[PDB]
Design a protein around this ligand. Structure first.
Ligand code: ADP
Ligand code: ADP
Ligand code: MG
Ligand code: MG
Length: 558
C-alpha cells in the first residue's frame, strides 16, 4: 500500500460519503499500531460505528483500545460543536433582539457549512496542541476539511463581525470561532506541509466519484497541499464476474472507470482496495482490509402517485452521485409516455441522456442548465452588486465565501426558478433541489435572477421533494440529514428513492449477495423510520442512456 509508506504525523482522508474513508482509516490505524508506532484514530462523526468496531465506548476523550496495543481512539462530534456554537452565540441575543433577527442568526449559523467549519475547528485543536503531537506518532484522521473551509480560515482576517450583519451568505459561522486566528493559520500551515500531512483521497471506481475526487484534489492542490495519494476503494474482484451477468457488468464498468481516470489524478500514487467478501464489522475484518428475492415497491407506484396528483413539481434531492439525474430523466420520460406534459430540466451537461427523445415526443421539453456557468454568473453578479464598497480584505473574503457549495446551490436554484415560471400547468421534473439551509437563507433575505417563493415549495399539493439514497449506511444517514434539514425548512419530502439497489437486481454471486443482504437491511431501515413512501430502483447492468433503457428503471421486468 503506497499511501502507508513513510507516513507523516497526520494522515487525513477525504472523498464522497460512503466510499470507505472510515474503514480505510481504521485499517490503517490497526496496521500502524501493529508496526509498534502509537496512533490516534480521530473519527470525525458521532454516528460512526468505530466504538462498536473496536468494542470500546469512544467519546470526546482519548480512549485507549485494549484490543489493539498502542492504539488510541478519539471521536470528534462536529454536530455537537455546531450546537455549542448556536448555544453560545444565540442565547446572548435571545429575547434581546426581535425574533426575526434571532431566527436569521440561527439559520445563518446552521447547516452543512457550520458543521464543516466546526469540524475544521476540532481538527485545528488536534493539529496544534503540543500534547497530542508529542505523544502519538500518527494522528490518523478520518475526514479532511473541504478546500473551501481551509481557504476561508486561511484568509488575512476581519471575520469577527459577520453575525448580525443573511444576504444568502454562509460566511457567518466564522464569528462563532472563539480561538486565535494564529491557531487556525498554524493548523493550515501544518496541514499543507508534505512532511506533516498526507491527505489521502478515497474514491470508488466510478466515473462520477472519480470526477468529484479529481475536483477535490484540484482544490486541495490550489490550497498548497503538494503530495497526495489516491485510494480507489471498491474494486470488484475479477474472479467474481466469472459466471454472473450483473457482476460482469459491474466489473466492466469499474475497469472502464479505471482506464479513464481524470488526467489530473493520473500522477498520484494509486492504490486498489478490493471489495473484501466478509462484512467489515469488528476488528477481525478490518485487520485484513489492506491486503434472496427482494419484494419492495418500484418507481411505478411513485410515478402513479405523481400522475394522480398532476400539475406539480417533482424535485429530486440528495447527495451527489446517488443518481438524481438519471432518476429525474426516467420519471420525466415515463410521465411523457403517459401523455401528460413534462419539462425535464437536468443539471448534468456531460450526460446526453434523454437527448435522443426530446424532439421525438412533442411534450417532453428539456432544459439543460449548466451549474458551473450559473455559479459563475451569480458570483459575478454578487461581486459587482455587493462588496464593491468593501475594502480589499472584505472583497477577498466575500469571493472566498462565494465558492461554497451553498452558493452553487443558490445559483442553480435561481436558474431553475425561471424554468418553473416559464413552464406553467405542466409537470416540472428537476435534478437537484436546494438544501433546507439554502431555502431558509433565501427566504430570510427577502429584501433579474429570482428564487421561487418558499410558500409554493412548502405546499405538498404543488411540490414533491423526492430524496434519492444510494442504499448504504452512510449515504442513508446523510440523506436522512438532508431530509431533516428540509423538514426544518418546512418542506416534507414526498417519498424516497433507494437507487442502485443490488438487492433488487437479483444478485447471483457471493460478493453481490452479501452486498444485497446489506442493502436489504438498509432498505428495511429506510422504510421503517425515514420515509413513509419509498421505491427501490434495481441496479442496471447497462448504463442508463436514452429512453429505451431509461424506461427500464420505471418498469423493471420482475
Ligand atoms: N474495501 C471494502 N470492502 C468491503 N466493504 C467495504 C470496503 N470499504 C468500505 N466498505 C463498507 O462500506 C461501509 C461504509 O463505509 P464507511 O467507511 O463507513 O464510509 P464513510 O467513510 O462515509 O464512513 C462499511 O460498513 C463497510 O462495510
Ligand atoms: N439505477 C441505476 N442503475 C445503474 N446505474 C445508475 C443508476 N442510476 C444512476 N446510475 C449511474 O450513476 C451515474 C451518476 O448518476 P447521476 O444521476 O449523474 O448523479 P447526479 O445525481 O450527481 O447527477 C450515472 O453515470 C449512471 O450511469
Ligand atoms: Mg465516516
Ligand atoms: Mg446530477
Amino acid at each position: 500500500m503506497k499511501f502507508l509508506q513513510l507516513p507523516p504525523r497526520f494522515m487525513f482522508f477525504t472523498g464522497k460519503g460512503g466510499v470507505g474513508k472510515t474503514s480505510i482509516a481504521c485499517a490503517t490505524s490497526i496496521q500502524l499500531a501493529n508496526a509498534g508506532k502509537r496512533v490516534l484514530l480521530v473519527s470525525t462523526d458521532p454516528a460512526s460505528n468505530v466504538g462498536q468496531v473496536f468494542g470500546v465506548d469512544i467519546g470526546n476523550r482519548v480512549t485507549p483500545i485494549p484490543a489493539v496495543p498502542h492504539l488510541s481512539a478519539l471521536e470528534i462530534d462536529p454536530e455537537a460543536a455546531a450546537s455549542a456554537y448556536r448555544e453560545r452565540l444565540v442565547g446572548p441575543v435571545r429575547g434581546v433582539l426581535p425574533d426575526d433577527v434571532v431566527k436569521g442568526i440561527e439559520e445563518s449559523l446552521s447547516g452543512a457549512c457550520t458543521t464543516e467549519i466546526a469540524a475544521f475547528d476540532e481538527f485545528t485543536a488536534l493539529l496544534t496542541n503540543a500534547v497530542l503531537t508529542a505523544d502519538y506518532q500518527h494522528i490518523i484522521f478520518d475526514t479532511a476539511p473541504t478546500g473551501h473551509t481551509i481557504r476561508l480560515l486561511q484568509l488575512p482576517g476581519a471575520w469577527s463581525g459577520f453575525l448580525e450583519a443573511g444576504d444568502a451568505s454562509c460566511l457567518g459561522p466564522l464569528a462563532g470561532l472563539e480561538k486565535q486566528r494564529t491557531q487556525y493559520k498554524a493548523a493550515v500551515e501544518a496541514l499543507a506541509d508534505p512532511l506533516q500531512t498526507r491527505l489521502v483521497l478515497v474514491a470508488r471506481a466510478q466515473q462520477a466519484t472519480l470526477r468529484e475526487v479529481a475536483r477535490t484534489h484540484e482544490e486541495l492542490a490550489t490550497i498548497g497541499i503538494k503530495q497526495q495519494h489516491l485510494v480507489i476503494n471498491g474494486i470488484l474482484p475479477s474472479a467474481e464476474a466469472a459466471n454472473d451477468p450483473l457482476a460482469a457488468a459491474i466489473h466492466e464498468r469499474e475497469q472502464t472507470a479505471l482506464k479513464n481516470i481524470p488526467a489530473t489524478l493520473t500522477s498520484l500514487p494509486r492504490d486498489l482496495v478490493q471489495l473484501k467478501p466478509f462484512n467489515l464489522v469488528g476488528l477481525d475484518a478490518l485487520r485484513q482490509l489492506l491486503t434472496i428475492e427482494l419484494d419492495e415497491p418500484g418507481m411505478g407506484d411513485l410515478v402513479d402517485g405523481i400522475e394522480a396528483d398532476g400539475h406539480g413539481l417533482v424535485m429530486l434531492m440528495g447527495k451527489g452521485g446517488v443518481g438524481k439525474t438519471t432518476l429525474a430523466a426516467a420519471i420525466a420520460v415515463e410521465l411523457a409516455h403517459r401523455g401528460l406534459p413534462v419539462h425535464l430540466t437536468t443539471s448534468d451537461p456531460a450526460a446526453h441522456l434523454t437527448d435522443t427523445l426530446e424532439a421525438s415526443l412533442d411534450n417532453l421539453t428539456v432544459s439543460r442548465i449548466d451549474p458551473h456557468a450559473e455559479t459563475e454568473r451569480y458570483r459575478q453578479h454578487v461581486l459587482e452588486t455587493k462588496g464593491a464598497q468593501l475594502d480589499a480584505e472584505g472583497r477577498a473574503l466575500l469571493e472566498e465565501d462565494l465558492h461554497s457549495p451553498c452558493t452553487e446551490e443558490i445559483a442553480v436554484f435561481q436558474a431553475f426558478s425561471r424554468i418553473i415560471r416559464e413552464a406553467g400547468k405542466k409537470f416540472v421534473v428537476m435534478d437537484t433541489a436546494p438544501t433546507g439551509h439554502t431555502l431558509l437563507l433565501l427566504d430570510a433575505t427577502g429584501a433579474t435572477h429570482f428564487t421561487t417563493p418558499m410558500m409554493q415549495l412548502r405546499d405538498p399539493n404543488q411540490t414533491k421533494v423526492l430524496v434519492v439514497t444510494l442504499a448504504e449506511t452512510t449515504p442513508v444517514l446523510e440523506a436522512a440529514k438532508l431530509q431533516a434539514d428540509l423538514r426544518r425548512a418546512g418542506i416534507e419530502p414526498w417519498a424516497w428513492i433507494i437507487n442502485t439497489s443490488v438487492a433488487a437486481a437479483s444478485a447471483k454471486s457471493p460478493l453481490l449477495r452479501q452486498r444485497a443482504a446489506n442493502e436489504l437491511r438498509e432498505i428495511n431501515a429506510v422504510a421503517n423510520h425515514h420515509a413513509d413512501r419509498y421505491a427501490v430502483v434495481p441496479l442496471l447492468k447497462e448504463e442508463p442512456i436514452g429512453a429505451e433503457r431509461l424506461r427500464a428503471l420505471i418498469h423493471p421486468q420482475t
